[PDB]
């Protein structure tokens, strides 16, 4: 059935401080010893699409991989047909086109009364034999910040009987990412996100996203 | 020759040969390959191939578009016949360095630059590099350079008004262009505009005057000698690994040296949709090097 | 070269050693006679001896034949002088000679006439040494000393006692000249300024003598007495000289495009290899014309200038070597590297000062620049591009360094091309001092010629055609050509990230790359001397000594500026300086280099520097690209500026030294070294207030006042007063203007980089 493209618009809303990090050139001058990745122009916290893609793939590797995934190249057919796989014929390019995530409530944050869009979390480590506390500082994209999340799944004539399984995979990836962290030191209360206004709309071509939206939202 | 396809970008990575480099504008080969791949994956490959093989088809390199169609600096026309000045050598070298640093002129002042006027570059995009890792074996650290545009700068391409090309463009605006398209980099939004009345009369394919190529084009052997014997030009390599679904291993597609933009020539010539596939491999790689010219003074 | 040509060369180069001998001994005899009978005491060669004796045309010219080489040498001296030496009447009056010649004045600084007028400075005559501190010109070094000349005379006598006047020794002797007479004035007459070194003057005289001999041989004119002495004024109008040049495009892209580990060794090896390729281009072009290194005015950064004889033969060899070396470069490096040659015809008249037009002066160089640019725009013919586009190769794997597909080989489980394998081998051979040109062994440096670095003890076991010695002023047992590069290396590049930490663990684990460039160096070459004297100071002598001074500062002195520092100078030639090291030592080295450049050039030439800060294991191409972007951003700030770690922190360089490093950073260190964890943590709040000032100006100055006085109240009673001083000083910085605000922010950033424990 003919070409189609389906876009999963959503609003990532950090419930806990996000620390995707990765200061290289611009964010490298942050004077924090762990700056969050920012926009080079507006100095705004950004959730790169690579983080979302990698975290979703690693999360779905624990559900839709019957064999043990020693390498991402040895992933199951379902995962490699969406996220791609460099070492096979049919699955060389995946069906998922992730996009970066930019701050969308900066004006709302100004209205609330914030001065900066990235707080500084102070932590420390306690030695076990001695008890001297070694302190440290790490940046955190403050909570209640929204990012525009936009993922497109392509529907091709040849890959048509696998649409429902793929849709279940995106659902199970987005709702696993809502349960696990999103980058950063997540095992210490970090990177907790939530996808608000989770809505799928066909954009190019035509498809019955009306059956998908009802099973996407709520349940 | 007919339209002024504009594409607003927010983040893109057009490799210059290495993954750590990212050019401001993509060449015509990249967009032609993207369109061919989109037509192949949709199903209508043969229609696009037939349209491309026709002489009516046109495509140009991506050029900046910021409140007015911008264009490539004409290579070889800072000519001293309109650049003779009585200033000291300090100012002469300063203006020579400024001209060499310039890479894109505005359509409103292209003829002005041909008269000897001096112009400067403008804030279009910032080339930033982000470092990422692979936490599956914890022994990887790669870097990707991007070209995040601002100051409301878009990119534009000149192509014919055709339902197929418009459909492929609209399908491409949610597939990205170049680089890690399935990682965030490359996406854009399409708009279709009419060529301004100060450009359509000069955007040409055939006269005998001096015509700036607006495409990375490679003449056929019939008129190559006449092209370089009285021409000013630049050479670019279209090398790379050929993306293909019919091999388990990547193959280096054949290297190709093409005339960049804006290369000035004394006359027009004919391009080529050249096969650069490695030997003994059924489906080929098509490299688009077909001229779209600009008439000058 | 012919034996007659060699004798002419030696007579023209050694015709002014008599000045040195006269100044060392104090004798009142004419310098020509003293040089001649000193030559007779060391060598039995009548032609060179009487060329030195009779280079003064007024000294008994009737005793020389009409075809004598001396009539060439003499006119060559007048050409290398850019001044008429007859019209002065200094040549026939001994009493007036004793009054005009001020032999009690040392060599003046070439920059005394550069740009605007300032205090005159003079160089004390010293022998160049690779490990000796820079010889700075001073206004107190004007008086002449015989003791300095005594050691000069002793060394030149000792070196020339057993010297063989043969072609193979030629370059060696020239190096001896550069070692000795680079700070000895050529002339001491009061009416002129003694800013031409005698070594450079003699080198120009020899080059012009060889060019005149070639031009006259082509024209079939052997009556040198009639042409260059009887009709010297008429010959000054003849269009007999060429100022040629070549530029190699692709050097920086070839050097810095490395994508894999081991980029360090490849990077330094590529820099040295391109420098040696430019040197080989110059040497082979000179050999094809039967000339020597005296005709070489400048080699650096792939840019080189020659002075040649204007003949159809010279043009044919120029175009033939152009085609041959471009064919070799197309065969080995494809289109990555391309050499472009140009040449501009000029006459003697336009290099004098009584006959040169400053327009003409520049015009001499100009034509060649326009022709080189035209040949750079239009590179290859139809055959070349049709051949390069032939394709037909089915390749699955590529080179992992420069992504080449030609002649891939396996090395360390990695696929590299032949050139990459050659640079792999050459990186281990950089440590040697001698580099030979063989026919097949080593990195392909030219048509049927390869470069190979081999130690001294093995030099007897290899067949070579030309030998280069790197950073050596001593005439060794092997007749070699001496080249100088900036190649100080403290450790391997991957260790500089760890080397930044001190013994106590302080210091960020990051490296830095500095790219530095002298602004308007080309304008300095072209019109720097025309500002004074209404353009009369524009002769080839002044440009040549400016070139030699730039080479002296940026090829050997930078090695001493890098001493005891954890850095490696990858590329230092002409105006571009590229170094990688620990960030503290890199910034240190940049500050010292510019301070000494300002002191060296008397503030006439400024520097723009970019210092990028990077993490361990970062790709080197990306390093160079970001640091060059910062350098360009610094160039944008009306030049003379430094860009530290970002285009945001762009400062005037003198302001950076006076205000940022030793004024704000010193006070911040003095304060926060005496403070506990809380005060050190307050630095981040200070930086955040500095960055946010524009949005909330008055609320921010309020907040800063609060934070400073709360730390006041938190400081101990004994340490309270110093805090009051710091609080007042920092509040003054914050409320003064944006420049002091940015300077304080940069000082805080540097300090927090210094104390970081992680």
- A120 to C646: CB separation less than 8 angstroms, yes or no: no
Q: How many helices (H) and strands (E) does chain A have?
A: 5, 8
Residue C328 sits at the vertex; the CA angle it makes with C324 and C330, to the nearest 5 degrees, is 115
**Signed CA dihedral, B86, B88, B91, B97: sign only:** positive
Instruction: Tell me the structure's resolution in angstroms, rounded to a single decimal.
Output: 2.7
| DSSP assigned state of B258 | E
Q: How far is C283 from chain B (nearest CA, A)?
A: 30
Chains in touch with A (3+ beta-carbon pairs under 8 Å) read B, C
Q: How many helices (H) and strands (E) does chain C have?
A: 29, 17
Q: And the tokens for A205?
A: 């071509």
Q: What are phi and psi of A138, to 5 degrees?
A: -140, 135
Residue C60 gets the label, from left (phi > 0), alpha (psi -120 to 50) or beta, of left
* Environment class of B109 (CB within 10 Å of its CB; exposed 0-12, middle 13-18, buried 19+): middle
| DSSP assigned state of A45 | B
**Signed CA dihedral, C662, C665, C668, C674: sign only:** negative
Beta strands in chain A (DSSP E): 4-13, 46-47, 96-97, 101-102, 118-126, 133-141, 146-155, 195-205
Pairwise CA distance, residues B18 & C258, whole Å: 10
Q: And the tokens for C470?
A: 């790197």
> Looking at chain B, which residue has its C-alpha nearest residue C527?
B89
* Environment class of C312 (CB within 10 Å of its CB; exposed 0-12, middle 13-18, buried 19+): exposed
Dihedral of CA atoms C629, C630, C632, C634 in degrees, nearest 10, equals 170
Q: Decide: A46 and A100 in contact? Cβ < 8 Å.
A: yes
Size of interface A-C (CB pairs under 8 A): 28
Residue C392 contacts B, CB cutoff 8 Å: yes
Pairwise CA distance, residues C14 & C588, whole Å: 43
Pairwise CA distance, residues C216 & C202, whole Å: 21
Q: Decide: C12 and C205 in contact? Cβ < 8 Å.
A: yes
Q: And the tokens for C226?
A: 């009639």
- The two beta strands, C467-470 and C481-483, are parallel
Q: And the tokens for C323?
A: 């085609």
Residue C280 sits at the vertex; the CA angle it makes with C279 and C284, to the nearest 5 degrees, is 125
Three-class SS of residue C670? helix
Neighboring chain B residues of A12 at a CB cutoff of 8 Å: none
Residue of C688, C746, C748, C753 to mutate when probing chain A, most A C-beta within 10 A? C688
Q: How far is B183 from chain C (nearest CA, A)?
A: 21
* Residues 6+ positions from B13 with CB-CB distance below 8 Å: B22, B144, B145, B146, B147, B178, B179, B180, B185, B186
Cβ–Cβ contacts within 10 Å for residue C684, how many? Answer: 17
Q: How far is C752 from chain A (nearest CA, A)?
A: 7
Q: How far is B190 from chain C (nearest CA, A)?
A: 31
Pairwise CA distance, residues C55 & C16, whole Å: 9
Q: Decide: C232 and C71 in contact? Cβ < 8 Å.
A: no
For this PDB entry, the determination method is cryo-EM
Return the closest-CA partner of residue C682 out of C713, C655, C640, C642.
C713
Within chain A, what is the greatest distance between any pair of CA atoms? 68
Q: Which stretches within C220-262 are classed as H helix? A: 224-225, 232-235, 251-256
Residue C381 contacts B, CB cutoff 8 Å: yes
Pairwise CA distance, residues B31 & B288, whole Å: 9
Q: Decide: B195 and B158 in contact? Cβ < 8 Å.
A: yes
For residue A18, the Cα-to-chain-centroid distance in whole angstroms is 11
Q: Decide: C170 and C203 in contact? Cβ < 8 Å.
A: no
Q: And the tokens for C224?
A: 């040198």
For residue C20, give the H/E element and its range.
helix C17-25
Q: Decide: C507 and C501 in contact? Cβ < 8 Å.
A: yes
Query: Could you give the C-alpha distances from A2 to A155, A205, A208, B101, in angstroms and in order?
Result: 8, 7, 13, 48
Query: Could you give the C-alpha distances from C179 to C52, C293, C546, C678, in angstroms and in order?
Result: 21, 15, 17, 58
* Residues 6+ positions from C139 with CB-CB distance below 8 Å: C119, C120, C121, C122
Which domain, by its residues, includes A109? 1-219
| DSSP assigned state of C530 | S
For residue C482, give the H/E element and its range.
strand C481-483
- C756 to A33: CB separation less than 8 angstroms, yes or no: yes
Q: Decide: A167 and A81 in contact? Cβ < 8 Å.
A: no
**Signed CA dihedral, C372, C374, C379, C382: sign only:** negative
Q: And the tokens for C418?
A: 């032949």
Name the domain count of chain A: 1
Residue A156 gets the label, from left (phi > 0), alpha (psi -120 to 50) or beta, of beta
Pairwise CA distance, residues C383 & B229, whole Å: 12
- A97 to B171: CB separation less than 8 angstroms, yes or no: no
Pairwise CA distance, residues B105 & B119, whole Å: 8
Pairwise CA distance, residues C666 & B239, whole Å: 53
Q: Which stretches within C553-644 are classed as H helix? A: 558-561, 583-601, 620-636
Neighboring chain A residues of B132 at a CB cutoff of 8 Å: 22, 48, 50
Helix crossing, C677-691 with C697-714: angle to 10°? 170
b/e per residue, A120-159, with b = 16+ CB within 10 A? bbeeeeeeeeeeeeeeeebbbbbeebbbebbbbbbbeeee
Cβ–Cβ contacts within 10 Å for residue C540, how many? Answer: 27
Beta strands in C647-687 (DSSP E): 650-652
Q: And the tokens for A174?
A: 């987005």
Query: Could you give the C-alpha distances from C751 to B15, B148, C45, C754, in angstroms and in order?
Result: 37, 32, 68, 5
Asked, as a colleague might, if the bond just before B262 is cis with ω within 30 of 0, I would say: yes
Return the closest-CA partner of residue B267 out of B227, B229, B228.
B227
* Residues 6+ positions from C391 with CB-CB distance below 8 Å: B254, B255, B256, B276
For residue B125, the Cα-to-chain-centroid distance in whole angstroms is 16
- B245 to A89: CB separation less than 8 angstroms, yes or no: yes
Q: How far is C17 from chain A (nearest CA, A)?
A: 58
Location of structure tokens 């160079």: C624
For residue C564, give the H/E element and its range.
none
Q: Decide: C499 and C491 in contact? Cβ < 8 Å.
A: yes
* Residues 6+ positions from C79 with CB-CB distance below 8 Å: C204, C205, C208, C212, C348, C351
Query: Could you give the C-alpha distances from C39 to B213, C76, C199, C479, in angstroms and in order?
Result: 67, 20, 17, 21
Q: And the tokens for C535?
A: 């353009």
Chain A from 7 to 46: CB within 8 A of any C CB: 24-26, 28-29, 31-33
Q: How far is C395 from chain B (nearest CA, A)?
A: 6
- A28 to C677: CB separation less than 8 angstroms, yes or no: no
Q: Decide: C199 and C181 in contact? Cβ < 8 Å.
A: yes
Pairwise CA distance, residues B41 & B61, whole Å: 24
- Breaks in chain C (C–N beyond 2.5 Å) sit after none
> Looking at chain A, which residue has its C-alpha nearest residue B138?
A71
Query: Could you give the C-alpha distances from C428 to B253, C280, C421, C433, in angstroms and in order?
Result: 34, 21, 12, 12
* Residues 6+ positions from B266 with CB-CB distance below 8 Å: B208, B210, B226, B230, B231
End-to-end CA distance of chain A: 28
Pairwise CA distance, residues B34 & B169, whole Å: 9
* Residues 6+ positions from C721 with CB-CB distance below 8 Å: none
Return the closest-CA partner of residue C553 out of C109, C155, C108.
C109
Pairwise CA distance, residues C150 & C157, whole Å: 11
- A33 to C758: CB separation less than 8 angstroms, yes or no: yes
Neighboring chain A residues of C687 at a CB cutoff of 8 Å: 31
Q: And the tokens for C292?
A: 């020597």
Q: And the tokens for C187?
A: 């002339």
- C621 to B21: CB separation less than 8 angstroms, yes or no: yes
Rg (CA), chain A: 19
């Amino acid at each position: 059935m003919t070409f189609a493209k389906i876009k999963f618009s959503a609003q990532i809303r950090l419930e806990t401080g996000l620390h995707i990090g990765g200061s290289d050139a611009f964010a490298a001058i942050g004077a924090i010893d762990s700056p969050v990745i920012k926009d080079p122009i507006t100095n705004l916290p950004i959730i790169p699409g690579s983080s979302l893609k990698g975290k979703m793939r690693t999360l779905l590797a624990k559900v839709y991989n019957e064999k043990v995934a020693e390498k991402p190249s040895d992933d199951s057919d379902i995962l490699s047909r969406l996220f791609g796989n460099s070492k096979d014929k049919r699955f060389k390019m995946g069906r998922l086109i992730f996009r970066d995530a930019f701050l969308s409530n900066a004006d709302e944050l100004d209205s609330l009364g914030v001065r900066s869009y990235t707080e500084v979390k102070f932590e420390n480590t306690i030695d076990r034999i001695t008890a001297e506390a070694n302190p440290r500082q790490i940046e955190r994209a403050i909570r209640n910040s929204t990012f525009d999340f936009e993922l497109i799944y392509e529907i091709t004539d040849e890959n048509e009987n696998q649409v429902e399984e793929d849709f279940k995979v995106i659902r199970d990836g987005l709702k696993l990412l809502e349960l696990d962290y999103l980058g950063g030191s997540g095992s210490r209360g970090y990177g907790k996100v939530a996808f608000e206004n989770l809505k799928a709309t066909t954009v190019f071509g035509n498809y019955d996203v009306k059956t998908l939206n009802e099973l996407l939202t709520a349940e | 020759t007919y339209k002024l396809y504009i594409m607003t970008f927010q983040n893109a990575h057009f490799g210059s040969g290495t993954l750590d480099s990212s050019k401001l504008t993509f060449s015509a080969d990249r967009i032609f390959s993207a369109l061919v791949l989109e037509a192949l994956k949709m199903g209508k490959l043969d229609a696009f191939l037939a349209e491309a093989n026709q002489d009516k088809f046109t495509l140009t390199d991506a050029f900046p578009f910021q409140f007015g169609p911008f264009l490539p600096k004409p290579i070889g026309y800072p000519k001293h016949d309109q650049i003779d000045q009585s200033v000291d050598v300090k100012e002469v070298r300063r203006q020579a360095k400024l001209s060499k640093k310039l890479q894109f002129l505005a359509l409103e002042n292209v003829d002005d630059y041909l008269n000897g006027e001096l112009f400067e570059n403008e804030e279009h995009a910032v080339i930033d590099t982000v470092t990422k890792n692979q936490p599956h074996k914890d022994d990887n650290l790669y870097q990707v350079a991007t070209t995040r545009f601002s100051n409301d700068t878009s990119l534009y391409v000149i192509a014919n008004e055709s339902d197929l090309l418009n459909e492929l463009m609209s399908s491409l605006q949610y597939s990205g262009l170049g680089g890690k398209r399935s990682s965030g980099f490359g996406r854009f939004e399409l708009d279709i505009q009419n060529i301004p009345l100060e450009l359509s009369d000069r955007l040409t394919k055939n006269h005998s005057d001096k015509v700036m190529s607006l495409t990375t084009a490679l003449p056929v052997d019939a008129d190559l000698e006449e092209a370089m014997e009285d021409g000013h030009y630049l050479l670019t390599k279209s090398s790379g690994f050929a993306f293909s679904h019919a091999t388990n291993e990547n193959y280096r597609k054949q290297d190709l040296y093409k005339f960049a933009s804006g290369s000035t020539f004394s006359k027009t010539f004919e391009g080529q949709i050249v096969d650069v596939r490695p030997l003994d491999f059924p489906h080929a790689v098509l490299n688009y090097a077909k001229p779209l010219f600009f008439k000058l003074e | 070269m012919k034996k007659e040509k060699i004798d002419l060369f030696y007579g023209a180069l050694l015709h002014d050693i008599g000045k040195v001998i006269q100044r060392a001994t104090g004798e009142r005899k004419k310098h020509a006679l003293v040089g001649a009978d000193w030559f007779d005491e060391i060598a039995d060669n009548q032609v060179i001896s009487d060329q030195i004796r009779y280079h003064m045309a007024n000294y008994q010219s009737d005793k020389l034949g009409n075809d004598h080489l001396a009539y060439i040498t003499y006119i060559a001296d007048n050409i290398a002088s850019g001044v008429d030496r007859r019209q002065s009447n200094e040549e026939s009056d001994e009493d007036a000679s004793a009054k005009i010649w001020d032999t009690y004045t040392n060599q003046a600084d070439i920059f005394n006439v550069f740009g605007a007028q300032t205090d005159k400075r003079y160089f004390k005559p010293t022998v160049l040494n690779l490990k000796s501190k820079p010889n700075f010109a001073s206004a107190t070094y004007e008086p002449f000393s015989k003791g300095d000349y005594a050691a000069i005379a002793t060394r030149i006598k000792n070196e020339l006692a057993e010297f063989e006047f043969n072609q193979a020794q030629i370059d060696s002797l020239l190096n001896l000249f550069e070692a000795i007479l680079s700070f000895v004035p050529s002339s001491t007459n009061s009416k002129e300024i003694a800013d031409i070194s005698l070594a450079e003057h003699s080198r120009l005289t020899a080059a012009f003598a060889l060019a005149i001999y070639d031009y006259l041989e082509d024209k079939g004119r052997h009556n040198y007495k009639e042409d260059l002495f009887t009709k010297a004024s008429a010959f000054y109008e003849e269009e007999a000289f060429l100022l040629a040049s070549f530029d190699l495009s692709g050097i920086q892209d070839f050097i810095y495009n490395i994508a894999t580990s081991g980029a360090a060794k490849q990077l330094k090896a590529r820099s040295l290899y391109l420098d040696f390729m430019s040197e080989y281009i110059a040497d082979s072009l000179l050999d094809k014309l039967g000339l020597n290194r005296a005709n070489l005015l400048y080699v650096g950064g792939g840019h080189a200038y020659f002075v040649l004889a204007n003949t159809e033969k010279t043009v044919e060899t120029l175009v033939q070597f152009e085609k041959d070396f471009n064919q070799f470069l197309l065969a080995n490096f494809q289109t990555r590297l391309y050499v472009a040659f140009g040449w501009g015809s000029f006459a003697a008249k336009d290099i004098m000062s009584e006959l040169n037009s400053p327009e003409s002066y520049r015009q001499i160089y100009q034509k060649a620049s326009r022709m080189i640019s035209e040949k750079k725009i239009s590179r290859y013919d139809y055959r070349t591009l049709m051949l390069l586009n032939r394709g037909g190769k089915s390749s699955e794997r590529e080179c992992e360094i420069c992504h080449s597909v030609e002649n891939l080989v396996s090395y360390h489980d990695q696929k590299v091309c032949d050139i990459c394998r050659g640079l792999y081998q050459f990186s281990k051979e950089i440590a040697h001092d001698h580099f030979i040109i063989t026919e097949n062994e080593g990195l392909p440096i030219g048509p049927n010629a390869c470069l190979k670095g081999v130690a001294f003890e093995k030099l007897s076991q290899e067949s070579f055609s030309r030998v280069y010695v790197k950073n050596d002023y001593k005439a060794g047992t092997i007749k070699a050509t001496h080249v100088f590069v900036g190649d100080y290396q403290c450790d391997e590049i991957h260790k500089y990230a760890a080397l930044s930490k001190n013994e106590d663990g302080l210091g960020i684990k990051r490296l830095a790359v500095v790219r530095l460039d002298v602004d308007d160096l080309g304008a300095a070459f072209m019109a720097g001397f025309s500002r004074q004297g209404n353009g009369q100071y524009s002769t080839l002598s002044r440009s040549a000594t400016f070139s030699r001074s730039m080479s002296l500062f940026f090829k050997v002195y930078i090695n001493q500026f890098a001493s005891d520092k954890k850095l490696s100078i990858i590329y230092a030639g002409g105006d571009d300086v590229f170094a990688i090291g620990s960030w503290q030592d890199i910034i240190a080295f940049t500050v010292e280099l510019r301070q000494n450049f300002i002191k060296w050039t008397n503030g006439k030439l400024t520097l723009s520097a970019g210092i990028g800060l990077f993490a361990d294991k970062t790709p080197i191409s990306l390093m160079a690209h970001q640091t060059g972007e910062l350098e360009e951003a610094a160039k944008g700030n009306e030049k003379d500026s430094i860009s530290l770690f970002s285009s945001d922190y762009t400062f005037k360089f003198d302001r950076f030294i006076t205000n940022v490093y030793d004024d704000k950073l010193e006070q911040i260190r003095y304060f926060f070294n005496h403070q506990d964890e809380r005060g050190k943590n307050f630095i981040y709040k200070l930086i955040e207030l500095l960055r946010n000032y524009e949005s909330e100006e008055k609320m921010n100055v309020a907040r800063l006042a609060y934070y400073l006085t709360r730390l006041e109240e938190l400081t101990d009673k004994d340490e309270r007063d110093k805090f009051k001083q710091f609080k007042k000083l920092f509040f003054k910085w914050y409320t003064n203007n944006e420049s002091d605000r940015k300077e304080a922010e940069l000082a805080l950033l540097l300090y927090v980089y210094e104390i970081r424990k992680d």
